[PDB]
Design an enzyme around this catalytic site. Sequence first.
Site, mmCIF file in Angstrom:
data_model
loop_
_atom_site.group_PDB
_atom_site.id
_atom_site.type_symbol
_atom_site.label_atom_id
_atom_site.label_comp_id
_atom_site.label_asym_id
_atom_site.label_seq_id
_atom_site.Cartn_x
_atom_site.Cartn_y
_atom_site.Cartn_z
ATOM 1 N N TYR A 88 0.821 -1.233 0.000
ATOM 2 C CA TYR A 88 0.000 0.000 0.000
ATOM 3 C C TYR A 88 0.847 1.271 0.000
ATOM 4 O O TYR A 88 0.264 2.327 -0.197
ATOM 5 C CB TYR A 88 -0.962 0.016 1.189
ATOM 6 N N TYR A 122 -4.972 -0.029 9.556
ATOM 7 C CA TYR A 122 -5.670 0.025 8.243
ATOM 8 C C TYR A 122 -6.607 1.240 8.253
ATOM 9 O O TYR A 122 -7.100 1.651 9.300
ATOM 10 C CB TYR A 122 -6.346 -1.303 7.851
ATOM 11 N N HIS A 155 -4.270 6.156 -1.526
ATOM 12 C CA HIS A 155 -4.862 6.209 -0.164
ATOM 13 C C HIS A 155 -3.784 6.481 0.887
ATOM 14 O O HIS A 155 -4.172 6.793 2.022
ATOM 15 C CB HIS A 155 -5.621 4.913 0.146
ATOM 16 N N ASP A 165 -5.681 11.781 1.435
ATOM 17 C CA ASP A 165 -6.064 11.837 0.007
ATOM 18 C C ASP A 165 -7.498 12.361 -0.159
ATOM 19 O O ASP A 165 -8.365 12.037 0.657
ATOM 20 C CB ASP A 165 -5.969 10.451 -0.605
ATOM 21 N N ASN A 204 -9.651 2.171 7.503
ATOM 22 C CA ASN A 204 -11.039 2.364 7.968
ATOM 23 C C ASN A 204 -11.111 2.140 9.478
ATOM 24 O O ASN A 204 -12.204 2.288 10.029
ATOM 25 C CB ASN A 204 -12.034 1.523 7.171
ATOM 26 N N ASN A 253 -12.946 6.928 4.098
ATOM 27 C CA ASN A 253 -13.196 5.894 5.134
ATOM 28 C C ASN A 253 -12.254 6.038 6.342
ATOM 29 O O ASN A 253 -12.564 5.402 7.326
ATOM 30 C CB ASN A 253 -13.096 4.479 4.562
#
Length: 196
Positions: A20, A71, A25, A98, A73, A119
């Site tokens: 990631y 993570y 994100h 973002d 969310n 999120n």
Amino acid sequence: GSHMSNISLIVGLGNPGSEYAQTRHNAGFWFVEQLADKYGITLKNDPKFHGISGRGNIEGHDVRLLLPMTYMNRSGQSVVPFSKFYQIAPEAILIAHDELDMNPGVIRLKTGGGHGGHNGLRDIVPHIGPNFHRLRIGIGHPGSKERVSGHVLGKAPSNEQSLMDGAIDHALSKVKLLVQGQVPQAMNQINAYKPA
């Protein structure tokens, strides 16, 4: 704890792991990692607050940096207990994230407002309310709500990455204003940014 609207916590949102690290994100991580290097703030393992954090001097102010490792969310599971523990009021918090609703190379400082479907912000605002500052890093929108997952977990093409990188670099130069409580001037100079 914190003091007025002198920014003393800077949060970068994103996802953990090398898969990631270069995705859109993680724009917030990019900004905070670059800020930490600019000011020599160590970002170290913070298992208590489920992230990576640091503390150091920015332009004569004691500032904390936080990257949630929950993570995206579950970001609030780091930001909320970290900010409560160090008695940092939302008004002293900057969250870099973002922004689907702005072009790559567009960057804005916003105070308050909703999550705009983000999120990570969706996991923070219900706990500390909306009155923190946000560094909205434009990443553009893929068209469909169905395509948002794949866009934000995508690696931007070099032109868009270059536009974002320039905007993030501009914003780094304006953090001195934020840690000094000069939110209005910071907002005028960040929002005025143009890539070309």
